[PDB]
Amino acid sequence: NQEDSMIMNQSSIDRGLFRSLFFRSYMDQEKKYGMSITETFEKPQRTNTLRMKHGTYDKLDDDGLIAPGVRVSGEDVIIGKTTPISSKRDASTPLRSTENGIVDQVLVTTNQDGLKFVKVRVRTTKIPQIGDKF
Amino acid sequence: EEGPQVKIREASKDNVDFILSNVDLAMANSLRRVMIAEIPTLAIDSVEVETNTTVLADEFIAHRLGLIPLQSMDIEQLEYSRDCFCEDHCDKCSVVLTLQAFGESESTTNVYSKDLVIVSNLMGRNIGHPIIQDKEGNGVLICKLRKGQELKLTCVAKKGIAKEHAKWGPAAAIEFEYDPWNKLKHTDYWYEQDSAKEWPQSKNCEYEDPPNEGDPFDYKAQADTFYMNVESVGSIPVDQVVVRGIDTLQKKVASILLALTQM
Amino acid sequence: PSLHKMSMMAHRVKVIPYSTFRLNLSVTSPYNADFDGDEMNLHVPQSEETRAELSQ
Amino acid sequence: MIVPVRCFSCGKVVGDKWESYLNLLQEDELDEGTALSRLGLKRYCCRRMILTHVDLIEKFLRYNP
Amino acid sequence: KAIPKDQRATTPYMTKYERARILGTRALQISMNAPVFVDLEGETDPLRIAMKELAEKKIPLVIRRYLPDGSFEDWSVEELIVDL
Amino acid sequence: KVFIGRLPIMLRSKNCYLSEATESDLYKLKECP
Amino acid sequence: RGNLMGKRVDFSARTVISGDPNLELDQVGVPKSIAKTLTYPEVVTPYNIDRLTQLV
Amino acid sequence: ATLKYICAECSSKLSLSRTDAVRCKDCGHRILLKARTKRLVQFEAR
RNA sequence: AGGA
Ligand SMILES: Nc1ncnc2c1ncn2[C@@H]1O[C@H](COP(=O)(O)CP(=O)(O)OP(=O)(O)O)[C@@H](O)[C@H]1O
Ligand SMILES: [Mg+2]
Ligand SMILES: [Zn+2]
Ligand SMILES: [Zn+2]
Ligand SMILES: [Zn+2]
């Protein structure tokens, strides 16, 4: 506990001392491109584009969205989206590499226009550890 | 009667005051540590969630379920899953609890330690029953629901120790004191005018003689006589937090002998 | 900062648990480090030649 | 936000002691220092648990879904 | 220009920088599977072997000490005093 | 008579819905009192 | 000053620091995760061949 | 069995497919939530 | 907008 550091009761931490909830909302929307060229919220496979993320697409359901129960981890794809051109380019939103947790709330709405708008809240519990500030 | 002596000052369901005499401090303390740290208990260690419409998070509730004290009377006739030969768990190594609650009422529907139901076979052994020390017989308040707020969980309680997680803590605080009159000079009182005035007198001062000023310093004097209070949580009864502590420490030593034998 | 010859010193690795770099307390003054949430940088030499420079 | 089971510091079960502490205050018109003490909470670690709790759950319960 | 052996006026002692550069160079060489001029008495670290070569004074290298004008004195690691 | 653009309203101001709302209303409205 | 005098570099790590009375003045506590990332390029030599074959 | 989406306010189950209108089958409010997995979640209680 |  020398030079501005402290000793914490590991026992207390187990009992719930200083534990916190951490949330984060990843968001996306289907974009329409003039000539009725829309993006798709779907789980993509190979199909001529091959331009997809290095992590699992398997946690995604047929709507290109993870169910609100699922444990997510690396660069697991949270939102599945595609943009074809004159075909499935990948526009899939992966969980911030540095993070992990459990899918908390998925929200499927409408844009001010009329496009498919999506928001994904992910939740983790942060337990007091050695380098933590107080 | 034998080597180190014991004299219970006050006993109850969940607290034992006693005076440990004819011992070394290093031994009273080693016993102190064991009672906190190394006596096995049963505690929920796996929570599988089916439904939660609650205002609380799956893991927040999960954390709470572990801390709910369970019957660990016959804990010795249960295996550590680590040692048990199954894929995951079984009746030899675990107790399976169930919790289902729904807000049928308009008023806030509560979720208690009692609402847990054993679904596994207890092999006719006193284990897994949620400890209810409560006046109205409810035990720990896990949660609160409103209307369509539902909760569905399956819990696997397992044998474990405090060193792994404090939820397997068989005992709450352990009172420990020696030399209420500081005759050993194991402390040096911080004061302003008078140490004797500024510092409160211990209740244990009554069970030892005052120093008497007109006496030289007893350097030969060693520490024996320990005023202790062991408090139980419910999992194991007070006497057994003491006894099982003594037995745990004893086995811990015996292992060293056996280790030397294999060598 | 790194206003010093001593604000960059060579150390012996000690692989350990938990997520923080651990330093001896006496070494605290040359770096001007404290543990109110300070972070530090580690640089690994890739040569047998550069390693010597560091140790020597 | 919902009464902690067990005192952080010593581990004494405190999860049951909430509903009663609130009754001893309303129904029994008692002061906090007595109510806590009647419930057995003697060590200040145990006392702060019940005394300094802010049962936020009750607010969250007030939202429809 | 290159100063002759008689006429050399630099230190008869090896510099902290010279010693370091020699140990480094020899460690790098030993590590690149170069021949070792000492019995490795169970030795395996090329730096530890380099210290042994410098101790037995069996390092076949020369320090070319340049002067500000461009001239230089050549010194054998054999002839350089190691009070370092 | 004629539409001349849209003005961002400050929450809890006279022109905002919540100004006149009761605790019970705000809770319905999914807003923290 | 941005890309020549100073540069971003590989074989570099950064975390929070904490003091340790059980570390020697000259050592540094390196979190396992950091050690499992930072790499040193060792040459296959007869002296190390067996050791290296094991780390691989 | 199976309830694809849940309405954010009235909490009524919706169960819709791609191109089936992002709106509630009673009230308006285009909000819609996802309804948690059948693949069940398990936590170490520590 | 924050960190030593
Ligand atoms: N803007 C800045 N630029 C560079 N270094 C800075 C800086 N601000 C702070 N520091 C560094 O951080 C050190 C600590 O400053 P502070 O965090 O404010 C605590 P303190 O002022 O040293 O007093 P204390 O040790 O009694 O608590 C400084 O001595 C300095 O090296
Ligand atoms: Mg600082
Ligand atoms: Zn088993
Ligand atoms: Zn306490
Ligand atoms: Zn609706």
Q: Tell me the CA distances in angstroms from B120 to B46, B62, B125, B132, E61, one per residue in order.
A: 14, 19, 12, 20, 79
Ligand 1 pocket test, pick from A2, A4, A5, A133 with the greatest ligand atom count within 8 Å of Cβ, gives A4
Q: Is C37 in the pocket of ligand 1 (CB under 6 A)?
A: no
Residue whose pair of structure tokens reads 């979640």 in the numeric block:
H41
Nearest to A10 by CA among B56, D3, D12, B169: B169
Domain count, chain H: 1
Chain breaks in chain B (C to N over 2.5 A) after: none
Distance separating alpha carbons of residues B227 and H28, to the nearest angstrom:
71
Nearest to H4 by CA among H27, H39, H36: H36
Check if the beta carbon of residue B38 is closer than 8 Å to that of residue B248. yes
Nearest CA to ligand 1 atom 3: C1
- For testing contact with chain G, the best of A1, A2, A129, A133 (most G CBs within 10 A): A2
C1 touches strand I (CB under 7 A): yes
Q: Is C32 in the pocket of ligand 1 (CB under 6 A)?
A: yes
Distance separating alpha carbons of residues A18 and E25, to the nearest angstrom:
54
Q: Tell me the CA distances in angstroms from B239 to B27, B230, B235, one per residue in order.
A: 18, 9, 12
Q: What angle do CA B42, B48, B50 make, to 5 degrees?
A: 140
Contacts of D63 in chain F (CB under 8 A): 27, 30
Counting other chains too, the contacts that E43-52 makes at CB distance below 8 Å and 24 or more residues apart are E43/G47, E44/G47, E44/G48, E45/G47, E46/C48, E46/G45, E46/G47, E47/C48, E47/C51, E47/C52, E47/C55, E47/E23, E50/C52, E50/E22, E50/E23, E50/E24, E50/E26, E51/E23
Domain that holds residue H44: 1-46
Distance separating alpha carbons of residues C39 and G15, to the nearest angstrom:
5
- For testing contact with chain C, the best of E28, E29, E33, E51 (most C CBs within 10 A): E28
Residue of E nearest to G46 (CA): E33
Task: Supply φ then ψ for residue B209, to 5 degrees.
Answer: -85, 140
Q: Which nucleotide is nearest to A133 (CA to C1')?
A: I3
Residues B45 and B152 both lie in one domain: yes
DSSP secondary structure letter of residue A30: P
Check if the beta carbon of residue B171 is closer than 8 Å to that of residue B231. yes
Beta-carbon pairs below 8 A across chains D and F: 5
Give the distance (Å) from ligand 3 centre to CA of residue A73: 30
Technique used to solve these coordinates: X-ray
Q: What angle do CA B23, B27, B32 make, to 5 degrees?
A: 120
In this complex, do E44 and G43 lie within 8 Å of one another by their Cβ atoms?
no
Q: Which nucleotide is nearest to G16 (CA to C1')?
A: I4
Question: Is A113 marked active-site?
Answer: no
**Domain CATH code at residue B110:** 2.170.120.12
C53 touches strand I (CB under 7 A): no
Rounded to 5, what percent of chain G is helix, strand, coil?
20, 25, 55
- Strand I bases, protein C-beta under 7 A: 3-4
Task: Supply φ then ψ for residue B53, to 5 degrees.
Answer: -115, 5
CA of G38 to C1' of I2 (A): 29
Check if the beta carbon of residue B141 is closer than 8 Å to that of residue B130. no
Residue B249: CB atoms within 10 A of its CB come to 18
Task: Supply φ then ψ for residue B102, to 5 degrees.
Answer: -150, 140
Residue F15 CB-density burial (10 A; 0-12 exposed, 13-18 middle, 19+ buried): exposed
Sign of CA dihedral D24, D29, D32, D35: negative
Check if the beta carbon of residue F29 is closer than 8 Å to that of residue F18. yes
The two tokens of residue B185 are: 């000079």
Q: Closest approach of chain E CAs to the CA of C12, in angstroms? A: 15
DSSP three-state, residue C23: strand
Check if the beta carbon of residue B205 is closer than 8 Å to that of residue B183. no
Distance separating alpha carbons of residues B120 and B103, to the nearest angstrom:
26
Query: Which amino acid, H16?
Result: L
Pick from B44, B50, B148: CB nearest H45: B44
Atom number, ligand 1, closest to the C-alpha of residue C32: 31
HEC string of chain B equals: CCCCEEEEEECCCCEEEEEEECCCHHHHHHHHHHHHHCCCEEEEEEEEEEEECCCCCHHHHHHHHHHCCECCCCHHHCCCCCCCCCCCCCCCCEEEEEEEEECCCCCCEEEEHHHEEECCCCCCCCCCCECCCCCCCCCCEEEEECCCCEEEEEEEEEEECCCCCHHHCCEEEEEEECCCCCCCCCCCCCCCCCHHHHCCCCHHHHHCCCCCCCCCCCCCCCCCCEEEEEEECCCCCHHHHHHHHHHHHHHHHHHHHHHHHHC
Contacts of H18 in chain A (CB under 8 A): 41-42, 62-63
Rounded to 5, what percent of chain C is helix, strand, coil?
30, 25, 45
Check if the beta carbon of residue A63 is closer than 8 Å to that of residue H18. yes
Pick from B141, B146, B166: CB nearest D16: B141
Residue B215 CB-density burial (10 A; 0-12 exposed, 13-18 middle, 19+ buried): exposed
Domain count, chain D: 1
Task: Supply φ then ψ for residue E63, to 5 degrees.
Answer: -95, 125
C37 touches strand I (CB under 7 A): yes
Residue whose pair of structure tokens reads 């005394």 in the numeric block:
D51
Distance separating alpha carbons of residues B241 and B28, to the nearest angstrom:
14
Neighbors of chain B with 3 or more C-beta pairs under 8 Å: A, D, H
**Which residues make beta-bridge pairs with A24?**
A122
Check if the beta carbon of residue H23 is closer than 8 Å to that of residue H5. no
**Domain CATH code at residue H12:** 2.20.28.30
Task: Supply φ then ψ for residue G38, to 5 degrees.
Answer: -70, 130
Give the distance (Å) from ligand 1 centre to CA of residue C33: 9
Residue whose pair of structure tokens reads 């290109």 in the numeric block:
A64
Distance separating alpha carbons of residues B25 and B4, to the nearest angstrom:
12
The two tokens of residue H20 are: 């089936």
Check if the beta carbon of residue B115 is closer than 8 Å to that of residue B140. no
Check if the beta carbon of residue A19 is closer than 8 Å to that of residue A125. yes
Q: Which nucleotide is nearest to C33 (CA to C1')?
A: I4
User: Is A113 part of any known ligand binding site?
Assistant: no
Distance separating alpha carbons of residues A73 and B68, to the nearest angstrom:
30
CATH tag, A20-127: 2.40.50.150
DSSP three-state, residue F31: coil
Give the distance (Å) from ligand 5 centre to CA of residue B52: 21
Residue B258 CB-density burial (10 A; 0-12 exposed, 13-18 middle, 19+ buried): exposed
Nearest to B128 by CA among B156, B101, B151: B156
Residue E82: CB atoms within 10 A of its CB come to 13
**B82 contact partners, CB below 8 Å, separation of at least 6:** none
Sign of CA dihedral B82, B88, B92, B93: positive
Distance separating alpha carbons of residues B110 and D3, to the nearest angstrom:
13
Q: Closest approach of chain B CAs to the CA of A70, in angstroms? A: 12
CA of A46 to C1' of I1 (A): 41
Residue A33: CB atoms within 10 A of its CB come to 9
Q: Which CATH number fits domain E1-84: 3.40.50.300, 3.10.440.10, 1.10.10.10, 3.90.940.10?
A: 3.90.940.10
Residues B73 and B95 both lie in one domain: yes
**Mode of pairing for the β-strands spanning A37-38 and A32-33:** antiparallel
Rounded to 5, what percent of chain F is helix, strand, coil?
30, 0, 70
**B254 contact partners, CB below 8 Å, separation of at least 6:** none
Q: Tell me the CA distances in angstroms from B162 to A10, A13, B40, B165, D49, one per residue in order.
A: 11, 13, 8, 5, 21
Burial string for B117-147 (b: 16+ CB within 10 Å, else e) reads: ebebebeebebbbbbbbbeeebbbbbbbbbb
DSSP secondary structure letter of residue D46: H
Check if the beta carbon of residue D45 is closer than 8 Å to that of residue D36. no
**Which residues make beta-bridge pairs with A105?**
A121
DSSP three-state, residue A134: coil
Resolution (A): 3.4
Domain closes at, from B100, B135, B166: B166
Check if the beta carbon of residue B42 is closer than 8 Å to that of residue B75. yes
Nearest to B172 by CA among D12, F12, G19: D12
Distance separating alpha carbons of residues E79 and E58, to the nearest angstrom:
11
**Domain CATH code at residue D58:** 1.10.10.60
DSSP labels for E28-75? HHHHTTPPPSS--SS---HHHHHHHHHHTT----EEEEE-TTS-EEEE
Residue B230 CB-density burial (10 A; 0-12 exposed, 13-18 middle, 19+ buried): buried
DSSP three-state, residue H14: coil
Distance separating alpha carbons of residues C36 and A1, to the nearest angstrom:
11
Give the distance (Å) from ligand 2 centre to CA of residue C36: 5
Distance separating alpha carbons of residues H26 and B186, to the nearest angstrom:
78
Nearest to A55 by CA among A4, A91, A97: A97
CA of C4 to C1' of I4 (A): 17
Pick from B43, B62, B148: CB nearest H43: B62
Nearest to D2 by CA among D46, D60, D56, D62: D56
Helical (H) or strand (E) element with D34:
helix D32-38
Distance separating alpha carbons of residues B94 and B82, to the nearest angstrom:
11
Query: Which amino acid, B55?
Result: V
Domain that holds residue D15: 1-65
Torsion (CA) H38, H39, H44, H45 in degrees, nearest 10: 0
Sign of CA dihedral H23, H24, H27, H33: negative
